[PDB]
Amino acid sequence: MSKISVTVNGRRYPWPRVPAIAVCLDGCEPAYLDAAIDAGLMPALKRIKERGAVRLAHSVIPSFTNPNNLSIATGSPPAVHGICGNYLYEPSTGEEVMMNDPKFLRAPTIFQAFYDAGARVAVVTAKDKLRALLGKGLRFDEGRAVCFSSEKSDKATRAEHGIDNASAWLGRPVPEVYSAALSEFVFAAGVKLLREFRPDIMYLTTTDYVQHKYAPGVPEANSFYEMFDRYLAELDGLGAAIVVTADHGMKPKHKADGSPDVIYVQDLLDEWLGKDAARVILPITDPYVVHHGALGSFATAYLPDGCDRSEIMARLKAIQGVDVVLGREEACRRFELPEDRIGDIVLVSSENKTLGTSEHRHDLAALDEPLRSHGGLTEQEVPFIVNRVLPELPNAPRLRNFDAFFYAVTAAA
Ligand SMILES: [Zn+2]
Ligand SMILES: [Zn+2]
């Protein structure tokens, strides 16, 4: 007898005999888990690690939320699926266009591929914009798909989400967006779906709210992972094959005085090339944001026609804190990104620095706690833990976070 599989984006996924789940712990620097385990707060994960398979994996660069979530969802890097940031810039028109709409997704998800093959599929996110992206191609007329967010859980309908009012269904209120509870709702929904819906494939993804605010091992960080462990215990006890990974890590990005350590790339380019001759893009978040949330460790820039790219790169790279500067072609080859959605140059900053645009007009400092962020090579390493015995499982750099479903279904088969 032939084995049953589904082929998606050139990869062969064995049919899972038991439910296959991937959990994306947003911004989960490996140190978060080590600290919570050491504090005695994660007895389930501690045992799961001992008896299963423990690895580190590499995220996509940029180590941003949407590109990595969509990589996990498709089993492919952004060169394939097309989502490499929250927005890009079009030199013609001079318009900044969002890339968090499903029309911009260029490859099928693992979710759609399994759904089309007759599987039961569940996707739960914390944020609703991601929900629409991740849910592309799912259908809700056969009772075989559920896709909703914690954020908009009370708005879910049978026809568009596979469930009527997920808040009422779960019996929990819609959480505050800026909270740990937004993520707890996802885990709780995941458990109830595993019990009652019985998916073949399920994705649970959270937000990095706690992680931007709190360093590994502090009470508020520990409490978050202590909470997660309870849901992990339940999912594991219900018999699912589970991969726990992350979209990216998290590092401090502040000076000794606690203030943001920022390299203002637009100011530099305005000086060398003329004001607004070049355009610096900060794709870690939406383009309208000017409140420290727009500070990450990866940026891209569009340069004036005919200018000496090589010279500009060298000037930028010479700056202490700018670690990597690459042209479009090299950046796309090295980081596996789409050429048509990246600028002329790509910048990656040092471990404890971020990249900004300008000091004139400026970016206001909102929250009080010292800046923590991601986007760079120093937030690429993420946990990758499976609750099954898998001696052949690779390790970083070979193992990627977007191998999560490949190995989850392999374990489940
Ligand atoms: Zn994230
Ligand atoms: Zn973030």
DSSP 8-state assignment for residue 300: E
Q: Are residues 186 and 322 in the same domain?
A: no
CA 98 to ligand 1 centroid distance, Å: 17
d(CA 209, ligand 1 centre) in Å: 9
Distance between CA 225 and CA 210 in Å, rounded?
A: 10
Give the ligand whose atoms come closest to the C-alpha of residue 64.
1
- Phi–psi pair at 335, nearest 5 degrees: -100, -5
Query: Is residue 247 a known part of a binding site?
Result: yes
User: Taking the chain, what is the end-to-end CA distance rounded to the nearest angstrom?
Assistant: 15
Give me the sign of the Cα torsion angle 78, 189, 98, 267: negative
> How many angstroms separate the alpha carbon of residue 212 from the centre of ligand 2?
7
Q: Do 40 and 174 lie in a common domain?
A: yes
CA of 383 to the centre of ligand 1 (A): 14
CA angle, residues 290, 296, 297, in degrees to nearest 5: 145
Which alpha helices (H) appear in 197-317, and where do they start and end? Answer: 209-213, 219-237, 265-273, 309-317
Judgement on whether residues 358 and 270 belong to the same structural domain of the protein? yes
Strand segments, DSSP code E, in 234-297 are: 241-245, 251-252, 262-264, 279-281
Cα–Cα nearest to 148, from 111, 209, 189: 189
Q: Could you tell me the distance, in angstroms and rounded to a whole number, from the CA of residue 314 to the centre of ligand 1?
A: 30
DSSP β-bridge partners for residue 384: 55
Indicate which ligand has the atom closest to the C-alpha of 286. 2
Rounded to 10 deg, the angle between the 219-237 and 43-51 helix axes is 60
CB 204 within 8 A of CB 186: yes
Q: How many CB atoms lie within 10 A of CB 166?
A: 26
The CA 249 to ligand 1 mean position distance, Å, reads 8
Question: Are residues 337 and 375 both part of a single domain?
Answer: no
Cis preceding linkage at 16, omega within 30: no
User: Does 292 show up as a binding residue in the annotation?
Assistant: no
Burial (CB < 10 A; 0-12, 13-18, 19+), residue 199, is buried
Domain that holds residue 34: 1-258+370-413
* Residues 226 and 316 grouped into a single domain: no
d(CA 34, CA 50): 13
Claim to verify: residue 203 and residue 215 sit in the same structural domain = yes
The structural domain count of the chain equals 2
Residue 11 in 3-state DSSP?
Answer: strand
230 Cα to the center of ligand 1, angstroms: 22
247 shares its domain with 342: no
- Contact between 205 and 130 (Cβ < 8 Å): yes
**CA dist 185 to 24, 113, 145, 362, Å?**
14, 26, 19, 36
- The reply to whether omega before 397 is within 30° of 0 (cis) is yes
Q: In angstroms, rounded to a whole number, what is the distance separating the alpha carbons of residues 106 and 91?
A: 21
Resolution in A: 1.4
101 with 134, same domain? yes
> What's the sign of the alpha-carbon dihedral 208, 76, 110, 384?
negative
CA 174 vs CA 33, 127, 167, 204, 232: distances in Å: 27, 12, 6, 17, 21
Measured in Å, residue 118 CA sits from the centre of ligand 1 at 31
CA distance 211 to 36: 13
Q: Is 26 annotated as a binding residue?
A: yes
Tokens of 237: 């006890």
Burial of 7 (0-12, 13-18, 19+ CB in 10 A): exposed
Do 363 and 312 share a domain, yes or no?
Answer: yes
Q: Do 332 and 387 lie in a common domain?
A: no
Instruction: For residue 117, give the DSSP letter.
Output: T
Report the CATH number at residue 233: 3.40.720.10
Cα 339 to Cα 330: distance, rounded to the nearest angstrom: 10
From the CA of 69, the nearest ligand is 1
As a whole number of angstroms, the distance between CA 294 and CA 355 comes to: 9
Residue 291 assigned ligand-binding role: no
| Tokens 């590092």 sit on residue | 251
Q: How far is the CA of 27 from the centre of ligand 1 (A)?
A: 5
> Do 350 and 294 share a structural domain?
yes
Of all ligands present, the nearest one to the C-alpha of 27 is 1
- The answer to whether 265 and 280 have CB atoms below 8 angstroms apart is yes
Structural method: X-ray
User: For the chain, how big is the Rg over CA atoms in Å?
Assistant: 21
Spatial CA neighbour of 278 closest among 355, 376, 331, 345: 345
Asked if 148 contacts 161 with a C-beta cutoff of 8 angstroms, the reply is yes
Same domain, 267 and 244: no
Cα distances from 301 to residues 46, 89, 90, 278, 298, in angstroms, run 44, 9, 11, 7, 11
For residue 325, give the CATH number of its domain.
Answer: 3.30.1360.110
* Residue 116 annotated as lining a ligand binding site: no
Return the ∠ at Cα 165 (arms to 161 and 171), rounded to 5°. Answer: 130
